Assembly symmetry: D2
Homo-oligomer: 424 residues x 4
Amino acid sequence: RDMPLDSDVFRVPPGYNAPQQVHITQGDLVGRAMIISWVTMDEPGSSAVRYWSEKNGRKRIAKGKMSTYRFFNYSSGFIHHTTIRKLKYNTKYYYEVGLRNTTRRFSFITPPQTGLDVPYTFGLIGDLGQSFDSNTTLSHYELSPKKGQTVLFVGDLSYADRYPNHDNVRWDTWGRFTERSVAYQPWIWTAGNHEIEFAPEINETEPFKPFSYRYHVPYEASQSTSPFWYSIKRASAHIIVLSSYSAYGRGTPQYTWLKKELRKVKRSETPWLIVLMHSPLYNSYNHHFMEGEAMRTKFEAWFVKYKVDVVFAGHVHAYERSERVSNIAYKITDGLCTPVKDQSAPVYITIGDAGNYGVIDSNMIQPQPEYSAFREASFGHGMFDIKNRTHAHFSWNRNQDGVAVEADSVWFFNRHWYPVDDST
Amino acid sequence: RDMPLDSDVFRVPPGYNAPQQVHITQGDLVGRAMIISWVTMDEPGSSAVRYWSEKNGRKRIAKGKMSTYRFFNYSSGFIHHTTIRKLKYNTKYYYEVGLRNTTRRFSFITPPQTGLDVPYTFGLIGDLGQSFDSNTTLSHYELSPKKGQTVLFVGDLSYADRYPNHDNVRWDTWGRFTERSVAYQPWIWTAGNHEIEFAPEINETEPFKPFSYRYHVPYEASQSTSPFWYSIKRASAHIIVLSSYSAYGRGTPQYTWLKKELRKVKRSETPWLIVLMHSPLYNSYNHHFMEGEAMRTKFEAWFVKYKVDVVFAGHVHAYERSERVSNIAYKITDGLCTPVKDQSAPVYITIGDAGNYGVIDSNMIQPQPEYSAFREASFGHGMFDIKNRTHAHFSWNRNQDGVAVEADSVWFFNRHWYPVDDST
Amino acid sequence: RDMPLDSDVFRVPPGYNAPQQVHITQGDLVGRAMIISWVTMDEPGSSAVRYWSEKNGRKRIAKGKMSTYRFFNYSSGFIHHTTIRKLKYNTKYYYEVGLRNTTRRFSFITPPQTGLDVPYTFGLIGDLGQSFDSNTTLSHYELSPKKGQTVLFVGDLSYADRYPNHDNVRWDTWGRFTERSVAYQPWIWTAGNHEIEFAPEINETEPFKPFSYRYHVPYEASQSTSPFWYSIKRASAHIIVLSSYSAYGRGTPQYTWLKKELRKVKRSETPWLIVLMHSPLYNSYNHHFMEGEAMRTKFEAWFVKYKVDVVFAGHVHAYERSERVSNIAYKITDGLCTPVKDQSAPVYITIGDAGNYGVIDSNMIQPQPEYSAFREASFGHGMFDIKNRTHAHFSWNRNQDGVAVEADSVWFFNRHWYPVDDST
Amino acid sequence: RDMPLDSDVFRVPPGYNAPQQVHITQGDLVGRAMIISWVTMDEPGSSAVRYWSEKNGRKRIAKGKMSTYRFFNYSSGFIHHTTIRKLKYNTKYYYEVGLRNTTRRFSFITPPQTGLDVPYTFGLIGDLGQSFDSNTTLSHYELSPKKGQTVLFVGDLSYADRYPNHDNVRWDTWGRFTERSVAYQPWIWTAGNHEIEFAPEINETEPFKPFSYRYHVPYEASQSTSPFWYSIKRASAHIIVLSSYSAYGRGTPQYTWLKKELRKVKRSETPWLIVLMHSPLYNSYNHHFMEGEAMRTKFEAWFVKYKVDVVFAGHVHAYERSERVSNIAYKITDGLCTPVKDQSAPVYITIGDAGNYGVIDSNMIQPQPEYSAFREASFGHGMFDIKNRTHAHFSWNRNQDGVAVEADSVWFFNRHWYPVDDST
Ligand SMILES: *[C@@H]1O[C@H](CO)[C@@H](O)[C@H](O)[C@H]1NC(C)=O
Ligand SMILES: *[C@@H]1O[C@H](CO)[C@@H](O)[C@H](O)[C@H]1NC(C)=O
Ligand SMILES: *[C@@H]1O[C@H](CO)[C@@H](O)[C@H](O)[C@H]1NC(C)=O
Ligand SMILES: *[C@@H]1O[C@H](CO)[C@@H](O)[C@H](O)[C@H]1NC(C)=O
Ligand SMILES: *[C@@H]1O[C@H](CO)[C@@H](O)[C@H](O)[C@H]1NC(C)=O
Ligand SMILES: *[C@@H]1O[C@H](CO)[C@@H](O)[C@H](O)[C@H]1NC(C)=O
Ligand SMILES: *[C@@H]1O[C@H](CO)[C@@H](O)[C@H](O)[C@H]1NC(C)=O
Ligand SMILES: *[C@@H]1O[C@H](CO)[C@@H](O)[C@H](O)[C@H]1NC(C)=O
Ligand SMILES: *[C@@H]1O[C@H](CO)[C@@H](O)[C@H](O)[C@H]1NC(C)=O
Ligand SMILES: *[C@@H]1O[C@H](CO)[C@@H](O)[C@H](O)[C@H]1NC(C)=O
Ligand SMILES: *[C@@H]1O[C@H](CO)[C@@H](O)[C@H](O)[C@H]1NC(C)=O
Ligand SMILES: *[C@@H]1O[C@H](CO)[C@@H](O)[C@H](O)[C@H]1NC(C)=O
Ligand SMILES: *[C@@H]1O[C@H](CO)[C@@H](O)[C@H](O)[C@H]1NC(C)=O
Ligand SMILES: *[C@@H]1O[C@H](CO)[C@@H](O)[C@H](O)[C@H]1NC(C)=O
Ligand SMILES: *[C@@H]1O[C@H](CO)[C@@H](O)[C@H](O)[C@H]1NC(C)=O
Ligand SMILES: *[C@@H]1O[C@H](CO)[C@@H](O)[C@H](O)[C@H]1NC(C)=O
Ligand SMILES: *[C@@H]1O[C@H](CO)[C@@H](O)[C@H](O)[C@H]1NC(C)=O
Ligand SMILES: *[C@@H]1O[C@H](CO)[C@@H](O)[C@H](O)[C@H]1NC(C)=O
Ligand SMILES: *[C@@H]1O[C@H](CO)[C@@H](O)[C@H](O)[C@H]1NC(C)=O
Ligand SMILES: *[C@@H]1O[C@H](CO)[C@@H](O)[C@H](O)[C@H]1NC(C)=O
Ligand SMILES: [Fe+3]
Ligand SMILES: [Fe+3]
Ligand SMILES: [Fe+3]
Ligand SMILES: [Fe+3]
Ligand SMILES: [Zn+2]
Ligand SMILES: [Zn+2]
Ligand SMILES: [Zn+2]
Ligand SMILES: [Zn+2]
């Protein structure tokens, strides 16, 4: 069900050496910087970006960097990444890319300054891929009357690794496909397993190669040493991104980084604390059942201890939302190994159902365990709408329903400023 | 408690640019190759090694490679690594190193061809370090009347990272200290946490740097893509080394590698299957209690499924030997989370008590759980003596006892050729 | 007059990932090693070469290396270079390349052991390019009844740098064009100015990049530190190759290397001493008149001192052969600045007329100076046929004449074993 | 004769990780930027530089870069290079270096904006080295009542290459020795042969390695692609630095660069045109007689054509000043090979007599040829004092004379604004 190469969605912008595959993300810790990235195929081109705010129409120029990579018998085009910094909060900016030959213009809006009661609405997309189903989820998102403002992406971007020799073209088409959204609003990236791409057979053994060339993140903003785990703050939220497929043993860089990072969250500043990861810690579908155990045994207590609000994951191609549950009492022989309701624990949601290559995970653990509050095997996307320092409303819209039909919906009460039972 | 820099044990071989810190390991999959490694400090020197068998006294020459590294305000000398290959099994070889200026001679004996009933005796050392205690354990090993023939090293080599800026000299002194043994019999390396050395503060953020420059392993012999997990066969054993501090998520290179590797073990060929790792899966001391959970949740079933015989670990600075136990029935809600006796399960032994910087882990879990067969907080080393395809005898000698006093002893019955009850 | 891309001469060998652009050169100092190089375009492929002698039909395998490069908006295919060594002198060998997918077979004949009276016939080609004229010179060579056995190539290989952005395809077509000769007999390479390719404008500023990726030479055989100046011995000749466009100041690597090298020539072993370079030291055409002055002032005396026999050059697109002349008496104010006949001096010949992009240099210094013995502005190639330690016969065949019509011809008397006046 | 290691001049600034070997140069094309460089030996340290003008005492900070290198059995400390830019012309600046641990303060004065009649006084030092003689020349310079404001350095900095394995310490001592001057006024660098350091024997074969790590120049300011030839404008002068030991063949990068650069000189803007190079084009001493021939044959005409005023060189350890001479009429056979007076030709001066390792080149060519205006084998330094767009006064002070005794003196009349006869 992968959309064919000629699909209107994969068409290449016309013009000589016209910037294609345009995409953006936050470029700093707090909201006033963006990383613009794109690809030119005819020749190298300029890595300069021109931008100006709607109000103070003064045109400034940011100069970035260019790179390329070869995968097997494949060779990328010219990848560019430029970071515009020191933007003003809450203002619309226009940016142009492809200055030398054919220029293209886009716009984005900086978020509001970080604050306790600042509202903001995030979209949740996981496991997109490029099937027709993928196309549908993306439009439904684009049409959600509750306008999404940033997409928190949970992993498995294009599934190009399913093609022979991981046909990296499929990375190009995906990038062209999603530009309609990412050229305009940032998508926060998380690495999934389809991004690992360990292919000894074709002599490609550096994990995450294509993904890392194409998608950049402000990892040094948090003091991370790798782009696979980082953190950013935006509006009233503090987002922490983790890498299920990187290492988390005690003492490793990721473990060490997260320990420090959790100590840096200030709920008086960013009330909402969200964590993103690919492989779900709590999952009742048969597929990938219990894979999240190892990371679970390692970070769960931290999450309960710092009161994280939600934990979004993907990987299982279906939907599921749990109860605030914890299972942090086991000591091997004491037999205390059963998830228990805990109002300090975060809610674990899994939205890996945006489409992939058109396949859904339907078999599930029967009967629905206690920790599971709702599960459904349908394609869709989610929206996490922050309202106050106390309220945030989550929704799940199915691809079968109309754009405005929330097939599941829930209010979240801030584990810090209003820890009442939302566990309903 | 660490031995002082002037300790006789740290003395530098005399002569201009005299080879120091000499050491060896198996260099191929089956036994007929060695990797000789050493360091010269005055100037680069030759990386050629001259060797000849006692019988056919014809002198041949192997040419290797030289490298250097800088840690913080530290600079290595000239590290050399040369692989002699195509040796004859079961023969004494003499090798000379430092051909240009001051030459030094050593010898080693290739192991017997791999076989079903070929006996061999391994020493077990873990968490050595360089305290006086360390010195002791090493001598006790050197004196075991049951002559050890290869040391399986379980991790934490020198604790140089405990010194300011990880004073890499402590790596040099450790290398000079242990030469008395390693220059003559191979030691199989395993990476522990003291080897990670992630020091962002001094701008050292590439894990395992010093360890990796200094200690090489034949990882491509198994088709591993990293030197932190590999496998070798020697005599009647098939040894598999893993990395607690590397990644093992589903799909990762280490996970992928182990799955394939277990499929390649042939018990009709190497009856004994041993696994090495630093952080113990089963451990009842308070210190580092339950750190091995994550990896446990990922590899335990495979170990039971392939009937691995023993699993040596270190990290807890003390001794402990368990019962053949398994705990692979948990499914979150079914409450089946208690280690059970399983005769397909391997025996988990932890020997991280060779000395470190002179400190013992004594606080235990009271009371001694069922899975724990014997535990003692004493410094010491172990020996695993293979006898037939069915028998192998393990011993633990305390540093307080005399060289020949086995403070713990047990016979192992091959999980494949003689599955009768050991566990006692 | 550049042959069009569809020219039958540029056709690509059929088959999946079929080795194309096959080419060879001597791979050691004395004749018993070859460097096989080729290109595969579909995918990487194997860098193994299979070969066996006609006599002892035992098939052996040599394993080489693979590399790639990008020039501007260009990306090479997979370049391979493999060195077969330890060949037997004077024997025919078959070699196959493209082992994995589509295999191609060729053959070559090792030269005879170096000796005083060993005959051998070299072809002289300079400034080839890929015009139709180039095609003609190459056939005339292929048809010279005096069968050439090795081509000494004087520089300016393909003129791809004349195309926009140095369209490196033109490097591919040239390589395909000349395979008919180079896959079978070695061509010794010399770097000319069309190989420098310094293009700051397109950000290509490393001189000799494409040339160096594609054409390899045994420069370490002589103890050279760069592939732009080296030396080889073959049959009764000792060939020295220099780089007009590299540096030759006093103290530089090239200067230093040549000084030592000249001291290593043994005329009792290789009677004939030949030097190759691109820019001619003695030239009477108007084009490039006096460019060879700087190198001249630096090496001429050495040449006269060691009695080099001939000095072949190219660059001027025409033919010219001089008298044994020297001009090494100048001391600024003494006015002794006029070429004089000297029987210790080498004969300077220029054959840069094989074709280029179809243009000839016709204007010449009028009147023909004394040092010039013969000059003609015609396209052609040359043959230097060694006979004894005393005799060697040089010929120049014009493209207008028939294959067997020597338009100029001369006997050379060895400056060492028979320094009589051949200056006729 | 070289000063001993304990010489007071080689003492190391006290303090932990105290900045040593401090030095500066122009950092842009026109005068408003500086490159501060230094070395810290205890540990890496900060590469930030703090500076503020005397007037507007606002302290700003520039952040630079750190690097290290290894020569043979030698290892550099931590070399730092930071470029302060956008300075105001003609103002005193103070700069501090070593911000983390022990800070040191220095000052410099930006030159006046480029102009037709802007005076400036340059010092001329060549072949300094570190003998006692060297110490002397440096003091004499420091004391010239005609205060020098920038040193144009002609090559051969330290002669470290004379020590075994080119004992790079001699590079450190030289850097500490000269700090007294260079930390305060820029010295413009030129590469000489003692900087090449091609030492195959110890496996060092990349020319100019130590020199290049330690001494940086603003070569991209002119659009040069290498740091061995560049150009800067300062006050009323346009200085062009060349590399005798780099390549200058037709087509090479240096040749190509100079041709374009000469076209960019505007005498209406910087009336005085100076060229620096190591090996002198015109020299009548026996030592190194005629080494400058090759480059001469390549660039002389261009110098006459663009009317360069002076050409300073070193290499011959003595002094010599010529007449405005040219010798650009030779055409091989026309016998016109004798230097002739030419008033468009520059004056060739050689000041390689600052000291070296205490040795003078005294053997001259007898008799003093016509082109030579004055020559003397004494240690000394020079000063080139620009006065107007028409006048500039050059002086040569011997080490034997007193600080104010000009042992040779001459007025230069601008070849462009006042071409009357100087040559006397
Ligand atoms: C390279 O660029 C030129 C124009 O700049 C274009 O016409 C040509 O087709 C390009 N080639 C490639 C391989 O992109
Ligand atoms: C691309 O833009 C540059 C602008 O400097 C122009 O010179 C060139 O001809 C343009 N078009 C193409 C097809 O390269
Ligand atoms: C994808 O969806 C868009 C609208 O959301 C539509 O215009 C387009 O035709 C669709 N393409 C495919 C291949 O489904
Ligand atoms: C690439 O191809 C296969 C992968 O296993 C193997 O035969 C070969 O050695 C690999 N690596 C290289 C460098 O060719
Ligand atoms: C939080 O938002 C909800 C819905 O928008 C509203 O009912 C509630 O009163 C808000 N809380 C505050 C403190 O305004
Ligand atoms: C370098 O080598 C020389 C002898 O080869 C020795 O005398 C000198 O002390 C060495 N220096 C270092 C830093 O090892
Ligand atoms: C080291 O060995 C070489 C052998 O070639 C010798 O030349 C040198 O002098 C020896 N001694 C030292 C101290 O380098
Ligand atoms: C270490 O033990 C050895 C014998 O095993 C002994 O000779 C040596 O003196 C000891 N050194 C220290 C510092 O304990
Ligand atoms: C090294 O020192 C500290 C480590 O956090 C930091 O200030 C600095 O940026 C680090 N990295 C570099 C390249 O200096
Ligand atoms: C195994 O070894 C033990 C002790 O050496 C012995 O009692 C037993 O009989 C041996 N088995 C075989 C098959 O020889
Ligand atoms: C890569 O290789 C596959 C087969 O191995 C081939 O079909 C495909 O077209 C190749 N692509 C390129 C760009 O060479
Ligand atoms: C190429 O050769 C390999 C031989 O191992 C084969 O598997 C493959 O299918 C062949 N053909 C192509 C088009 O790749
Ligand atoms: C090149 O010459 C060959 C024979 O020498 C001929 O078969 C071929 O057609 C010629 N091609 C062109 C383009 O001249
Ligand atoms: C490449 O294009 C031109 C060449 O002069 C220039 O503007 C640009 O800076 C060059 N280099 C890079 C890295 O873009
Ligand atoms: C050299 O060769 C020529 C022509 O082949 C012949 O006339 C002459 O006698 C030969 N010299 C010797 C020594 O055979
Ligand atoms: C490294 O730094 C420490 C202090 O930071 C210093 O005491 C030690 O002596 C230094 N070592 C070297 C080799 O500079
Ligand atoms: C160097 O400076 C730092 C300043 O942060 C200080 O912590 C350190 O102790 C100082 N002294 C030494 C000897 O490193
Ligand atoms: C170098 O000269 C300075 C003054 O110019 C003097 O103070 C110093 O002692 C001299 N040192 C030597 C070693 O000549
Ligand atoms: C370094 O030492 C000598 C220099 O000629 C030589 O024997 C050796 O091959 C050189 N290079 C290396 C990499 O050892
Ligand atoms: C040039 O300077 C000299 C000496 O300072 C002076 O005699 C002459 O008049 C000056 N020229 C101008 C134009 O001021
Ligand atoms: Fe997925
Ligand atoms: Fe330990
Ligand atoms: Fe040419
Ligand atoms: Fe000098
Ligand atoms: Zn997934
Ligand atoms: Zn440990
Ligand atoms: Zn040419
Ligand atoms: Zn010199």
